[PDB]
């Protein structure tokens with residue numbers, strides 16, 4: 409079994425890279441893939457760029473060069489649901505674009521032609537991710553994650569996202585792109601995001617402070633999930 | 640031929656005329672995309688039908704580059720005209736592409752710029768020059784300038800107003816070009832957009848697009864065929 413790992417948090421990618429045995433590096437397209445074994449399981453690891461095109465490029469390269477059986481995609485996100493807490497981990501049931509609009513031709517908002525309205529994560533991977541998160545004494549929240557190429561963290565902007573996607577739990581900038589690529593290649597995936605900030609609430613942590621702890625937690629989550637899936 | 644010319648269009652309607660002219664055609668079907676390889680009027684080509692929007696274009700461009708290794712990429716198809724001199728069927732040539740719907744201005748970036756990328760992607764000067772020579776040879780009306788891309792079909796109202804405000808130099812709007820430019824940038828592959836106008840991105844753009852997609856496909860195809868031949872030998 410070969411597990412592909414795409415992470416947004418630099419420190420998580422660095423820690424995982426350091427842990428990989430028999431490491432090799434594939435360098436191309438302004439992207440880099442690290443391959444080897446993580447605690448005995450073959451993996452392929454990439455740090456996602458920023459925004460949908462960069463994320464899609466990376467995902468496509470990882471799939472074509474490494475042919476993993478599944479994708480685990482980690483990072484951080486903004487929480488849209490007021491019931492979230494900083495440090496909660498959202499597990500995607502589905503991902504949608506908050507900035508796609510071909511409604512002039514009758515499509516649902518967020519849906520692109522030739523795509524479903526939302527890209528669904530794999531039921532087995534969702535369940536496995538949730539179980540691993542909970543085993544690490546963290547809180548897993550299943551729900552819709554929305555993505556787009558605008559960084560949105562202010563009250564007005566988050567309220568607009570919430571009006572268009574009232575069921576959305578979290579927002580960030582790469583999840584839907586990675587899900588779209590995986591979907592189109594028929595590769596099962598799960599998206600996991602640690603909640604850095606909740607809409608209209610001031611976090612007790614700076615983003616850097618959050619990343620210092622979240623990246624360590626996410627690294628452990630990945631190691632745990634890789635082991636559960638393979639062994 | 641010395642050069643292998645990569646060509647990317649989003650829709651069936653945009654690729655169908657070129658596809659039917661490929662000799663020794665083979666089809667690669669991967670990741671939701673279709674790639675057609677062979678010769679167009681003796682010139683080696685690799686024609687991608689990407690699907691619509693930025694991720695589809697990025698995915699497809701990546702596959703085209705990896706499987707076919709074209710020397711250059713031409714993005715063709717339809718576009719919404721923003722410059723005042725553009726009629727339906729007229730040609731637009733990129734000098735540069737930008738995302739109209741990217742915003743990380745909170746971190747000090749230019750509007751439309753994403754981290755790790757220039758604010759705009761410069762199209763290749765030789766490709767632009769070649770496109771312009773073709774325009775003159777074919778006696779067509781054209782505009783060279785900034786083309787902006789996003790995952791929205793622009794249909795007047797605030798969507799159009801936002802583009803005109805943020806990118807008053809944009810001559811056309813579409814849904815793939817900048818994504819392709821971004822992938823090409825990452826691999827240092829020369830790129831140019833040569834599209835034709837289907838609509839003017841106004842309140843009636845959906846009706847105009849429906850009616851005139853075929854005309855835009857015809858004119859963009861004529862341009863692309865002519866340009867392929869001009870580029871065949873380096």
Ligand SMILES: Nc1ncnc2[nH]cnc12
Nearest residue numbers: 718719792793813814840
């Ligand atoms: N009005 C429009 N908006 C976005 N993409 C387009 N492609 C063709 N016309 C368009």
